[PDB]
C-alpha cells in the first residue's frame, strides 16, 4: 500500500456571487485533512484526528501562510491574465504533494494549471520546470533563475512532505490504515453483476466485453463497485463467488 499527502489551491479571478476567490484543501490519501478559503480566512481541521493532535499554534501559523498564499495566487492570476491579455473570470490551480511507497521509496510532484489545462510541471530530480507555452516559459525562466526557489521546493517534496505524511499517518492510524472487506454479491439483472460495497481502501480488483463500474463513495467512509458481463481482490485478500 502506498500513502500520499497533497495540497490543492483553487483561484478564481473575478468570481461570480458565492464562489470563493481562493480555496486550499489538503488530503492524506483519500481523506480531506485541512481546508482554507478566502471567506473564512482560516485554516481549519477537516478530520477529527487532525484537530486532536495539532496544537493551536499549528493552525495559527499556517493560517498566516495561507493568507499570504491566497494573496500571491491573486497576484499570479493577474500576471497570467495580462500575459494572455484575458478578461473575465479565469481559473488557476495548484497541486503539490508526495507519496510513500511500500518499498520505502518516495515520489514528489508539483504542478500548476490555468483554466483547467497543464501549465507548469516541476521536476525535482533535474531542478527544472516543464512549461506548456510561452507564457508558462516566461514564468519558468523567472523561477529557474532563483536557485533558492528550486532547492526550497525540492526540499519540501523530498523531506518535509514525507515527514508530515508519516506524522499524519500516526495521527489517523485508526482510520487511514484500517481495512474493511467488501460485501460481495451476484445479481442476475437483465435487459452477471458482481456487486461489492462497504469496503476500505477503495483499491479493489474485480474480474471474471466485461463492463466495470466506478469505485464510488458510499457516504460512510466506505466504497462500492461492480463488474458486469467472480474474482475479487482487496488488500491482498482474494474472494471467489460462483453463479
Amino acid at each position, epitope marked *: 500500500r502506498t500513502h500520499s499527502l497533497r495540497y490543492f489551491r483553487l483561484g478564481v479571478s473575478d468570481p461570480i456571487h458565492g464562489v470563493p476567490e481562493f480555496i486550499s484543501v489538503g488530503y492524506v490519501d483519500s481523506h480531506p485533512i485541512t481546508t482554507y478559503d478566502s471567506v473564512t480566512r482560516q485554516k481549519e481541521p477537516r478530520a477529527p484526528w487532525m484537530a486532536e493532535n495539532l496544537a493551536p499554534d499549528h493552525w495559527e*501559523r*499556517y493560517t*498566516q*501562510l495561507l*493568507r*499570504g*498564499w491566497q*494573496q*500571491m495566487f491573486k*497576484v*499570479e492570476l493577474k*500576471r497570467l491574465q495580462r500575459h494572455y491579455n484575458h478578461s473575465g473570470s479565469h481559473t488557476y490551480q495548484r497541486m503539490i504533494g508526495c507519496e510513500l511507497l511500500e518499498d520505502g521509496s518516495t515520489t514528489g510532484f508539483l504542478q500548476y494549471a490555468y483554466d483547467g489545462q497543464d501549465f507548469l510541471i516541476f521536476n525535482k530530480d533535474t531542478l527544472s520546470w516543464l512549461a506548456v507555452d510561452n507564457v508558462a516559459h516566461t514564468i519558468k525562466q*523567472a*523561477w529557474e*533563475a*532563483n536557485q*533558492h*526557489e*528550486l*532547492l*526550497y*521546493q*525540492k*526540499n*519540501w517534496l523530498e*523531506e*518535509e512532505c514525507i*515527514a508530515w505524511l508519516k506524522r499524519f499517518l500516526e495521527y489517523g492510524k485508526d482510520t487511514l490504515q484500517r481495512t474493511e472487506p467488501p460485501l460481495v454479491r451476484v445479481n442476475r439483472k437483465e435487459t452477471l453483476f458482481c456487486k461489492a460495497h462497504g469496503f476500505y481502501p477503495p483499491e479493489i480488483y474485480m474480474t471474471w466485453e466485461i463492463d466495470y463500474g466506478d469505485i464510488l463513495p458510499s457516504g460512510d467512509g466506505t466504497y462500492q463497485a461492480w463488474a458486469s458481463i467472480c474474482h475479487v481482490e482487496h488488500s491482498g485478500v482474494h474472494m471467489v463467488l460462483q453463479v
Partner: T-cell receptor
Amino acid sequence: EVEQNSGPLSVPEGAIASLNCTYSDRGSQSFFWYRQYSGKSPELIMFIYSNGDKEDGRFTAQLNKASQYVSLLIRDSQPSDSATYLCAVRDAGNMLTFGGGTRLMVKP
Amino acid sequence: SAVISQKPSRDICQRGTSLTIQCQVDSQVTMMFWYRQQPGQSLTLIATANQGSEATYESGFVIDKFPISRPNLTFSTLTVSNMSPEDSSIYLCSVGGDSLIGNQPQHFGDGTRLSILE
C-alpha cells in the same frame, strides 16, 4: 527554538576560519549564514538545505542534520572578512530564528 | 532580489514625541518583519507584519508602543510612540517568502538609525 553561536574569534590571515552553529529544533529545514559589517545591515552570503558541504567561492557551508550543527568555512580568509557572522535557522512554519552572532577578527 | 527601501535613513528626535518609519519593497513578497538592533549587539525581532491586520509581536514589544500597519505586501510602517532615549536603536525591515520569482530568503533593508535625545 534556539540558535547558539560563539562570541569573539580571531583567525590568522590566509588561514581557514570556521564558524560553528548549533540549533535545538530537529524539524528545521533550511540554514542561512549572514554577514554584517559594523555599520551595515545583515547580508546573506549563502544557505544550505541538505547534509554535506556546499562551496561558493571561498565559502563552504557544512550541514549535519543528525548532530544538528551548521558550519561556515572561509578558506584563505583576509581582513576584508572581518565582520559579525549571523547563523539563521528556518523551521517548518518558514519562521527564521537568529543566533547571537560570532564576530570574526582576521589579523593581517 | 527584492529591493527593500527604508525611510528615513536617520532621524534625531525629542523624548515624548512619536515617529513613524516605513518600509517599501520593489516587489510583492509574502512575509515581512521588523527588527531592532543596537550597533555591535544582537538582532532582535520586534514583530511580524501581517497584511491587513495587526502585527504578531514578540515578547516585550507591545502594540501600543510599536504600532505596525501593513496595507499591502510591498508597504508597511512602524511607529515608535512616546519616544524615550531607551528606544534609540537601528530599526530594520526584513522581507522573505514567496514572490513572482519564487521563494526568496529573508533580506534586510539598510535600516533606520533612530537617536532619541533628552
